[PDB]
């Protein structure tokens, strides 16, 4: 019972072979180039194995509406060739097995939901903070997919009055992603976020911005668990600032231990570490296998 997973990123692809229980048997990664050549490497890798199903967790925005004619395509990107490229259908045609599809952050949510910090809950929110900011949510045991998958990284948050930086986001300027991504931190402070590990106000400001976004998510979605991943969150100091700031912003408006005394157990790193996403693609594979077995 072997499953394939593809975590399709703007900078690299990770492909993996694994099991329904989240075990990774083998993996490979390679640079993301143009679609045809990138997907050829995927097919060449998976050809070694005899797979029952594949799951794709993709960068987006994507068309994640199963009834849509453009289901399983990337709908917006500055990356050459990728917009409107028949990603899902190409993998289906080449592999001729069930192929599940979702956003990359949705897959990471499913990973943590089945095997990580939200195991035993029926709700969670997984947020990645790195090159960009995105989130996937589980509601009553199911991925949140309304009119679109969410794009929680592009919400406006309150600018810190001392912060002068104009914002990295090509669409909004100073949305959450514009103010608080990896590339935003770098462009603001003039150094990459590792030379800055020692400057406390970088992570104070970052923690402040993340806390502002989290208060919004808590008031709108009220997830039962918030999982923070991505390269930025490797600066573990940011968590302590978030823990300080969230109760301050909400000012005792909602009385739950998750939001006050036990906040450090509510907003957490992924149990699966940097592998939540690729493991979640195996969950997507398994779901596609189950859904086809019940045709
Ligand atoms: Pt090309
Ligand atoms: Pt295959
Ligand atoms: Zn934006």
From Swiss-Prot:
Disulphides: none
Keyword Isomerase: no
GO MF entries: ATP binding; fructokinase activity; metal ion binding
GO annotation, biological process: polysaccharide catabolic process
Enzyme class per UniProt: transferase
Obligatory cofactor(s): Mg(2+)
InterPro entries referenced in this protein's UniProt entry, alphabetically: ATPase_NBD, Carb_Metab_Reg_Kinase/Isom, ROK, ROK_cs
UniProt entry tagged with the keyword Nucleotidyltransferase: no
Regulation: Inhibited by zinc ions.
Any Pfam family matching the protein: ROK
Binding-site residues, ATP: 131, 183, 231-235
Residues the entry annotates as binding Zn(2+): 154, 169, 172, 175
Function: Seems to be involved in the degradation of glucomannan.
UniProt xrefs under PANTHER family: FRUCTOKINASE, TRANSCRIPTIONAL REPRESSOR MPRA
Identification of the protein by name: Putative fructokinase
Species this chain originates from: Bacillus subtilis (strain 168)
